[model samples]
Target: SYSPEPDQRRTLPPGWVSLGRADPEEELSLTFALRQQNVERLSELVQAVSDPSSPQYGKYLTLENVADLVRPSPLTLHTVQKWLLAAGAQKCHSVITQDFLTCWLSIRQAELLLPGAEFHHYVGGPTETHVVRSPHPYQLPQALAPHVDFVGGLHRFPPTSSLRQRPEPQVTGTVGLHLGVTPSVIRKRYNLTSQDVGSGTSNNSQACAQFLEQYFHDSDLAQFMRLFGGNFAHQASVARVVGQQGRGRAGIEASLDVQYLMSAGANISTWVYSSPGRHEGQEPFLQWLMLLSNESALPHVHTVSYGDDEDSLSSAYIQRVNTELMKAAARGLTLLFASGDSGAGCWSVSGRHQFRPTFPASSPYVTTVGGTSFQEPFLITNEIVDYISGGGFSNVFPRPSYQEEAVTKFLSSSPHLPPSSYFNASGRAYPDVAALSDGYWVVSNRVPIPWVSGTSASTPVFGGILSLINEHRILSGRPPLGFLNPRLYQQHGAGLFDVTRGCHESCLDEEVEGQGFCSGPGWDPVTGWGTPNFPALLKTLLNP
Candidate 1:
């Protein structure tokens, strides 16, 4: 038996502490997520397909192509299967493409096989979730350790739903100074409608990932579009996941995402992936990636309005999920994640005074969206970067090449810079884009509600726009615009409405470029490249 170094044995991950052991006879379930076999191949393929200069540019991947690249090595599968069985695993369910195995067995059996593993629970903040979790630092035979990326499902509680809420807007400067934000208002501002891109009849499609007992209700959408007034009905579908499906309670998160996406028909074929709560947040994300990675008729645009602050999850968990996102890019899918609702500092532990970027947004591959509020129709004058619209640099991922110029410009021009102590300036900076998020009207539980605010509002609204963009591309016989950061940083920024006013946090609240990062020329952390100007963006995107 070979001993893992101290770092390798992560007995207690960040934000989690120990409770105690459980009864040995207690039955439980677990998962083993393995690393994909080829790293260089996937990376090279992604770059080639996404890079305009490459010969493979616009040559999107097929299901067979992605499957071949993601499957783990035969030796790894054989050894892991034999190893689990030899360790007395009762029954196993696995996916070769996802490179993970799941099992059901007794605590006694799990304890016998996993060293230092125990039943434990932990918490992050007063308002944050308290969950029962397994001990970290899962151990394996040295031979099997390299083959097995991570063993999971011990602690699956407290899956962070990207849902956030705030008090209704305090309307200032009365008399139409601020109109309630809605899809039609948003579309009118952007010069878009359901009819703009062939009325959703084109082959363009969109999908929203739902977890933690959230289901998109049809009636909620029907009523919303009626109020908003668009030909958005009959273009939607729900993907109901069965089996040990986590209990679902109808939620506003699902309602908001679906209504906004379908608001303008845009010929948008919609799929709502509703997952049960059995595995918490990350498991559902993993399940989504696994399904999309192998599915043939994939949507060009995928939106996820769920995420946690980077610190809440273990580093291994972040790395594993991020790896799957990278594979998604290689397969020609543009994955958009809600940057998160906490300010520079998440509500978890950092509080409003400190700066903390959220995960998936922190991951460089996914397009992270931040929120802006309307000053007038079509103009974003106030970006509540501090009021729950997530911003700042990543702790997990370093900045990617696409954002280098813009990030460097911001850091060199701005002051404070998150102190470089709590945040990693060298890391990835988000979000890549912005949309209207303040006080969006919605029909929740058949009641029309006004002004629910969060990046949860920003994400699907942007996805609807992207759906129309994809629809236009298909109508022109061009491939979908997968992995948008490169083009966003390079081309789309020129056409975006640059927001130079309003800040939401601390001294950063100064109207001008404050001590911390604020809205200014070009790209800034608060509003990214600023909110979309549909006609301008369409010209830039379609022409480029």
Candidate 2:
């Protein structure tokens, strides 16, 4: 009555050394991602509501509406619950969506429930965190396989977080130009005036999600605002945090996201979603998505500076996650993800080489923000591609229809393109937009750190500006900008500055050696129609 889930099988990474079999008494917690009904129709509705030309534009659905359309059928839910309970699972729980079921059971009980799974203890990471996983594939009951998508906490491991920090650069003098990117520099470059801050009386709010043990401190945020955020009217502290904040010293990445998002979308109520992995086996990203599905009232804009290599994850997982993103879009939320710091990441197989892409940056549903650096005479407001800014085509997902024309033109127009074999031209490309990502000063651990750079910095900065725009839209009785890619591609870089210089780094192979994609006259992979001109962008979106 059981069937093998071959797609869920994962090979063990090199650093993990098995410590023999897992103890029979030791408990293991696994999350079952259940199959939702009518996902195709849900996708259609998401597109209809998000597309500007459609009559249903801005007609976003509520959490209950989405649940009613996509929640598992009664028979599917009953079958899954019955199977788990009969297997002696200790405890089971679900989120508001009722699609994901998390169950806890001993290793022995799990082995019995899923016939071929053999759990083992392994220690990895510099901290040597002990993890329980099954190197082999897992199985599910034949009757229940169709009801389940995939089980979490088995073999897959989280990828490294994408924040890149550089030591403070030594500069000789200041000629009325700031040495590093600060709030003042951002406002000056993006043409955001002091009056651009969000109004306190508005219903506008923004959020940032952190994972991989990252947390921001209230003290650090206050200090950041006092030091660099004096030019803007910004919130000194977060209005609410959705999860437990670690009592330890603040993380620079976490501090960078919160501080900049607040400063750029100044005076707006902010929420921080901190979902640290409680169990070593738990997937924090999945947990974060589950939280989103559960909460009905949430911020209109959310910026996530996190992603993993496309090849490292299972296709089923990414597809399901993209569905969640679509669901968010359908609910009128603008989700921004950092496009990753590695510029055209490299992947090798045998004698062949290809460009590596990161997701959900490569996902078609969400707007992905890339990175840029100030042009020559560092004081100048002009921009160029940061060599480390990640941009490329997805190997997992095909190019979506929204960006087809832009991508086709880029493919045909660019004279200095990389070898055709290096990337999949038919796959989805990113980022949808970009901003200053270099030489940022952040306050963390009660210290002012400098030169913290990545798409991580650019994402929150862009998200904040969107939050400000959202405030304006709401004030004008218009809905918040949801699923920005469709509208963004429709405009084809209107109301934005186009960066047409510089190329990002890529594979070091003999053929293509060290270069990935380059900036161009119009839409290019490096910057994605370029950075925002705030007032103009606001006007462009505010019209419709």
Q: Each model's TM-score? A: 0.84, 0.94
Off by over 4 Å in 1: 1-27, 96-98, 120-132, 135-137, 160-179, 197-200, 230-248, 277-282, 346-354, 376-386, 415-418, 506-516
Residue-wise C-alpha lDDT for candidate 1, range 218-243, written one tens digit per residue:
66766776677544334433333222
Q: Per-residue lDDT for 57-171 in model 2, tens only?
A: 9999999999998899998899889989998876787877789899899899988887778888776644344668888877777787678887887777654343334553565
lDDT of each: 0.67, 0.84
Candidate 2 residue 495 C-alpha distance from true site, Å: 1.3
Model 2: lDDT to the true structure: 0.84
